Amino acid sequence: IVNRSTFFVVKGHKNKGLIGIAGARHNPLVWLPTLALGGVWAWRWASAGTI
Amino acid sequence: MNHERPWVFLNKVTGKWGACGWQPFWKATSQSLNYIPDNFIALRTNGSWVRNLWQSSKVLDRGLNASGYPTVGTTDWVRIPLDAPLEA
Amino acid sequence: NKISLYRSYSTTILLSPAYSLGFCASIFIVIQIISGYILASNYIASTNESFNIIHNVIMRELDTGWLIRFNHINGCAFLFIVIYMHIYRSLYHNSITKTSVWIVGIIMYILICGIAFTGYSLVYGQMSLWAIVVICSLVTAIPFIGNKLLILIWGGNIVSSVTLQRIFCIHYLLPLLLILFIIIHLYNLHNVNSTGDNYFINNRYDRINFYPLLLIRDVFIGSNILIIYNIFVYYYSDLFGHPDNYVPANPLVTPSEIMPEFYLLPFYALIRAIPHKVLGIIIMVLFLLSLTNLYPIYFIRFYNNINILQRSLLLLLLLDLVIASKLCLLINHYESFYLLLILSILCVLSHHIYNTSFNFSNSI
Amino acid sequence: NKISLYRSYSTTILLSPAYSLGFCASIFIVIQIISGYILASNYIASTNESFNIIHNVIMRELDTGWLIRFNHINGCAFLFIVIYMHIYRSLYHNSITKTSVWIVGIIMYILICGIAFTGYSLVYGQMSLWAIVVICSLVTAIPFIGNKLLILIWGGNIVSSVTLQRIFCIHYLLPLLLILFIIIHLYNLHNVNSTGDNYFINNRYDRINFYPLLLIRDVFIGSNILIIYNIFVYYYSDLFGHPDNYVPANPLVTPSEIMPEFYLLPFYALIRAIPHKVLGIIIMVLFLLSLTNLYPIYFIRFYNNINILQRSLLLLLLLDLVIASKLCLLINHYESFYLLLILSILCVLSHHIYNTSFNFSNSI
Amino acid sequence: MLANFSRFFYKTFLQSNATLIPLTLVFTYXXXXXXXXXXXXXXXXXXXXXXXXXXXXXXXXXXXXXXXXX
Amino acid sequence: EGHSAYVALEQRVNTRQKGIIQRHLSPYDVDIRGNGFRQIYRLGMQKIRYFGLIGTPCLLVAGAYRGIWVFCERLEDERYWSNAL
Amino acid sequence: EQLDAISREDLIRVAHEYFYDKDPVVAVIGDTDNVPEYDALRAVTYSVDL
Ligand code: HEM
Ligand code: HEM
Ligand code: HEM
Ligand code: HEM
Structure with missing residues (x-):
């Protein structure tokens, strides 16, 4: 994808990440409903109506 | 798709038989001109099970001692495979 | 067991006197903490009493309240000077290899800039008010x-007493988080030890006990730098400041030139040299984020040595930053200095701290 | 490595719901910190406009400043209730054996008492002013x-705005030291683990992973405690307070009865039951110092088990403390209760926490 | 019935976080926030209606109208 | 100190040391003036040479900036003196 | 004959049916001081990303 051999290769230093498992991750488009609903739900103001 | 080859149910106490198998089916739509459907009931076969059923019909209707065949659950039915002609 | 006290930590023998800048910064952090705690015990944050309670109560009702205030001011200025020397030395000796120490240091630097700004805001003078106004005008872009967002920051359409009170709470709170970050800084350093003049891997026979030799050297250098510091406290008390902050704030009048403190001027330059406000905000955020070392994370990266070309370029970076500060102050009246301001800012933005080993590779 | 997270720390299976009191105390510490930081961002410390800005600006101009203030008050009350239950549990299960945990806990208790007092002082009402006056008079002996020393502490002959400003700064500062001491408390506990219902020496096959089971138990117990806590924030908002503190302070007028907060009453009792002021101060200092476990230092000492007799005497201690508080406040109108107050104080002062094996020995 | 329904429910909703998170948000909104909170609000507003602030304001306007035309 | 990253590094990289002899004199037997003037001279000369080396690019760029500064300053003086602002 | 008719998708379905988010049975003999307990093992049969 980069068209370069610009990464140092080390024995076993492969498929390292934070959240998921390499090669066992969903299509990133499956999280769009989650993000949309979360943004719409969270972004709301609330007032007690004290005069 | 890969399911079981067609078989023959046989009920012992009643002594009554009958072929059976898995029929795939899909929602009806336009067909294809350049395609004659393959063998779908007996996948990856030259369709000999029809010949085996025809040959074995006389054997089965005449009365077969199928005590050496597996049963189906707790019922009185046993399964006879149609891979090869049945003579017994 | 005094022996067990001596040998609890050992360092290299190549710690030249330039390696006491951390101790000097610690001294000035202590001075700021104590002076600020004493000032806060006599401080009221409001638009009707703040300026008065500094110049009429703190500096004239106590025996040496003026001395306490001058300590606070000049200690902030000297803390920034010492921190800049500390950073310059760290860049000179390729101390970015101490990854934990460097990241914690950058966090502390950003925190200290915030503390200084919020503190300068507490003297409700002309410069304080109008610096708040300009920075918030940056916010509203x-x-x-x-x-x-701006309203939430100000609690209104203008700077008011509630704004001063929240600024006071922030100014009080942040230095203590800074203390915790200093503790983490030192913990990481003691985990990885000090570079010294040159980097060597030493066994215990080549190292020396930290206590008491380096503590005594720190005392010596600290006394010298405290002499230099107190020369400013008693004889140049107002040299690191702008006189317009002795004029009580007038929301109806803007000063002729709004100028921040000398230690924030470079950032101000980054805003004057970028015409688009949004682009300036983005570039400031990228600048601060790029000072860190948080990327790459899971790609193999290691650090090589530093050379004479890199040291000369570091000196050039210092020159460019100083020129940018002066010019960004000078552009208000003279419009022909935009050329040199932009040139210096572009030169600053194109300085290499880490020599990317990825500079050299082959294509598929 | 999620698995490594599960096994990072393991404890005993005998953690009854009574072992969430520390978690509840931490919850109320968090609530106090947040609500206090919000209050302090709207607060001006001065005799002229302190009582006014609490009752007229914070409560009536903000949207829910009243709710913030009620949260803060009842959070202090419930923090003390939970800490008292926490101490009672630690005495019940013979947790004085966790020497470091116990000593840090006692230091934290003293700090929190100071925080509560200095906080109550900030509401410049009648009760606050005259509680300060009484305490500082006790200093005069x-x-x-x-x-x-009294003049140094007050900044003069009388409580004034400088005194309020000192108190405000101390009230702001101390809770952060308290957070540091809570961190040390938990660090020591993790070092020596928990007791549970009974004490056993368990190998790793008899211990359970702390996370997430005990975190979920903590969430459940904290939810119930927060229900109970909010039944007071919204329906009994001044049950723990005194109405005289809703009167702006007059230095010329003394209240009919000067009673501190319900969590300081025991200490007040010690003052009232000792006619001599110097002797009262000495007894107070000795009481606070004897709650700790700092002696013997180098003599060999170890802790044995606890029994039904000790637990019964612990119940008696609780009874005596409560009765002493009530009587200490009653004796202002009814002189005959001095007998019962003195009796309860004497019973309290002679309560055995640590059964000393030095009770039995021979003579040369 | 419960076995098949349980299998269907798990495999459809609870198996994947991509569905469980929106299900939890739906619960938060259409059950906790707009079903318990708003419910209690409406109930309180309805129980105490005769002495409501709005009722007092309306009666005041009416009485003022009456007093003015006299 | 034994559980520190630099100790771990020295254990991984360096061998088990052998055949090293160190001699130390107590400071009460060492004269503080012993090697003072020679070191002052040597270090002064070294720093002079090194700063002459690494300071040259900064000097050149500062000269160019000084030229630009003079030009702009006198341009703005001329602008102000002729009411051309 | 039945072994060359297996599909990779069928194999994936079989693997997902019986491994993902299922209760395992563990047997341990030896120094159980270092072998993780069941609860932790039950929490690693699924991933947050999925
Ligand atoms: C908890 C610690 C601190 C407290 C309580 C504190 C408190 C105060 C108070 C009350 C003022 C206003 C009084 C005055 O202006 O003279 C002030 C001003 C100031 N503080 Fe702090 N401060 C603390 C730490 C720091 C630190 C670490 C710095 C950064 C070096 C700092 C920088 C400043 C500056 C620049 C001013 C304004 C200078 C001026 O008056 O011109 N303070 N501080
Ligand atoms: C409050 C400000 C700061 C204080 C008090 C402080 C304190 C210290 C101290 C005591 C040391 C060890 C002694 C020394 O080597 O000088 C140190 C080392 C170091 N600091 Fe800081 N520091 C501060 C800011 C920074 C900043 C902003 C950075 C930049 C990232 C930084 C980076 C480093 C590095 C890299 C080292 C180790 C240098 C080496 O030995 O190679 N520090 N600091
Ligand atoms: C840094 C954290 C804290 C800050 C900034 C803070 C600040 C304040 C301020 C400004 C007040 C006066 C406003 C008012 O009286 O409503 C106050 C009152 C008070 N605070 Fe805090 N506080 C903090 C933490 C705590 C803690 C941990 C406690 C312990 C229980 C506490 C106990 C009290 C009490 C008892 C009062 C007076 C109660 C009353 O208003 O009647 N505060 N605090
Ligand atoms: C700010 C108030 C306090 C907080 C937040 C706090 C928090 C905690 C926590 C989280 C634990 C471990 C969990 C538990 O066993 O409940 C704990 C244990 C303990 N605390 Fe505290 N604590 C506080 C005050 C005290 C005080 C005043 C003492 C009295 C000395 C004390 C003595 C102990 C003891 C002895 C244990 C261990 C009990 C055992 O496992 O046997 N704590 N505390």
């Missing part, structure tokens, strides 16, 4: 949620 | 420096 955020797309979509800028204006509302 | 020290030999050879009571008046010099």
Whole structure:
């Protein structure tokens, strides 16, 4: 994808990440409903109506 | 798709038989001109099970001692495979 | 067991006197903490009493309240000077290899800039008010949620007493978080030890006990730098400041030139040299984020040595930063200095701290 | 490595719901910190406009400043309730054996008492002013420096805005030291683990992973405690307070009865039951010092088990403390209760926490 | 019935976080926030209606109208 | 100190040391003036040479900036003196 | 004959049916001081990303 051999290769230093498992991750488009609903739900103001 | 080859149910106490198998089916739509459907009931076969059923019909209707065949659950039915002609 | 006290930590023998700048910064942090705690015990944050309670109560009702205030001011200025020398030495000796120490240091630097700004805001003078106004005008350029954001920051359409009170709470709170970050800084350093003049891997026979030799050297250098510091406290008390902050704030009048403190001037330059406000905000955020070392994370990266070309370029970076500060102050009247201001800012933005080994590779 | 997270720390299976009191105390510490930081961002410390800005600006101009203030008050009350239950549990299960945990806990208790007092002082009402006056008068009894020290503490002959400003700064500062001491408390506990219902020496096959089971138990117990806590924030908002503190302070007028907060009453009792002021101060200091476990230092000591007799005497201690508080406040109108107050104080002062194996020995 | 329904429910909703998170948000909104909170609000507003602030304001306007035309 | 990253590094990289002899004199037997003037001279000369080396690019760029500064300053003086602002 | 008719998708379905988010049975003999307990093992049969 980069068209370069610009990464140092080390024995076993492969498929390292934070959240998921390499090669066992969903299509990133499956999280769009989650993000949309979360943004719409969270972004709301609330007032007690004290005069 | 890969399911079981067609078989023959046989009920012992009643002594009554009958072929059976898995029929795939899909929602009806336009067909294809350049395609004659393959063998779908007996996948990856030259369709000999029809010949085996025809040959074995006389054997089965005449009365077969199928005590050496597996049963189906707790019922009185046993399964006879149609891979090869049945003579017994 | 005094022996067990001596040998609890050992360092290299190549710690030249330039390696006491951390101790000097610690001294000035202590001075700021104590002076600020004494000042806060006599401080009221409001638009009707703040300026008065500094110049009429703190500096004239106590025996040496003036001395305490001058300590606070000049200690902030000297803390920034010493921190800049500390950073310059760290860049000179390729101390970015101490990854934990460097990241914690950058966090501390950003925190200290914030502390200094919020503290300068507490003297409700002309410069304080109008610096707040200008920085918040920078804030309101955020797309979509800028204006509302500004209101939440100010609690209103103008700077007022509630604004001063929240600024006071922030100014009080932050230095203690800075203390915790200093503790983490030192913990990481003691985990990885000090570079010295040159980097060597030493066994215990080549190292020396930290206590008491380096503590005594720290005392010596600290006394010298305290002499230099107190020369300013008693004889140049107002040299690191702008006289317009002795004029009580007038929201109806803007000063002729709004100029921040000398230690924030470079950032101010980054805003004057970028015409688009949104682009300036983005570039400031990228500048601060790029000072860190948080990327790459899971790609193999290691650090090589540093050379004479890199040291000369570091000196050039210092020159460019100083020129940018002076010019960004000078551009208000003379418009022909935009050329040199932009040139210096572009030169600053194109300085290499880490020599990318990825500079050299082959294509598929 | 999620698995490594599960096994990072393991404890005993005998953690009854009574072992969430520390978690509840931490919850109320968090609530106090947040609500206090919000209050302090709207607060001006001065006799002229302190009582006014609490009752007229914070409560009536903000949207829910009243709710913030009620949260803060009832959070202090419930923090003390939970800490008292926490101490009672630790005495019940013979947790004085966790020497470091116990000593840090006692230091934290003293700090929190100071925080509560200095906080109550900030509401410049009648009760606050006169509680300060009484305490500082108790300061005046020290030999050879009571008046010099009292003047230094108050900044004059009378409580004034400088005194309020000192108190405000101390109230702001102390809770952060308290957070540091809570961190040390938990660090020590993790070092020596928990007791549970009974004490056993368990190998790793008899211990359970702390996370997430005990975190979920903590969430459940904290939810129930927060229900109970909010039944007071919204329906009994001044049950723990005194109405005289809703009166702006007059230095010329003394209240009919000067009673501190319900969590300081035991200490007040010690003052009332000792006619001599110096002796009362000495007894207070000795009481606070004897709650700790700092002696013997180098003599060999170890802790044995606890029994039904000790637990029954612990119940008696609780009874005596409560009765002493009530009587200490009653004795202002009814002189005959002095007998019962003194009896309860005497019973309290002679309660055995640590059964000393030095009770039995021979003579040369 | 419960076995098949349980299998269907798990495999459809609870198996994947991509569905469980929106299900939890739906619960928060259409059950906790707009079903318990708003419910209690409406109930309180309805129980105490005769002495409501709005009722007092309306009666005041009416009485003022009456007093003015006299 | 034994559980520190630099100790771990020295254990991984360096061998088990052998055949090293160190001699130390107590400071009460060492004269503080012993090697003072020679070191002052040597270090002064070294720093002079090194700063002459690494300071040259900064000097050149500062000269160019000084030229630009003079030009702009006198341009703005001329602008102000002729009411051309 | 039945072994060359297996599909990779069928194999994936079989693997997902019986491994993902299922209760395992563990047997341990030896120094159980270092072998993780069941609860932790039950929490690693699924991933947050999925
Ligand atoms: C908890 C610690 C601190 C407290 C309580 C504190 C408190 C205060 C108070 C009350 C003022 C206003 C009084 C005055 O202006 O003279 C002030 C001003 C100031 N503080 Fe702090 N401060 C603390 C730490 C720091 C630190 C670490 C710095 C950064 C070096 C700092 C920088 C400043 C500056 C620059 C001013 C304004 C200078 C001026 O008056 O011109 N303070 N501080
Ligand atoms: C409050 C400000 C700061 C204080 C008090 C402080 C304190 C210290 C101290 C005591 C040391 C060890 C002694 C020394 O080597 O000088 C140190 C080392 C170091 N600091 Fe800081 N520091 C501060 C800011 C920074 C900043 C902003 C950075 C930049 C990232 C930084 C980076 C480093 C590095 C890299 C080292 C180790 C240098 C080496 O030995 O190679 N520090 N600091
Ligand atoms: C840094 C954290 C804290 C800050 C900034 C803070 C600040 C304040 C301020 C400004 C007040 C006066 C406003 C008012 O009286 O409503 C106050 C009152 C008070 N605070 Fe805090 N506080 C903090 C933490 C705590 C803690 C941990 C406690 C312990 C229980 C506490 C106990 C009290 C009490 C008892 C009062 C007076 C109660 C009353 O208003 O009647 N505060 N605090
Ligand atoms: C700010 C108030 C306090 C907080 C937040 C706090 C928090 C905690 C926590 C989280 C634990 C471990 C969990 C538990 O066993 O409940 C704990 C244990 C303990 N605390 Fe505290 N604590 C506080 C005050 C005290 C005080 C005043 C003492 C009295 C000395 C004390 C003595 C102990 C003891 C002895 C244990 C261990 C009990 C055992 O496992 O046997 N704590 N505390």
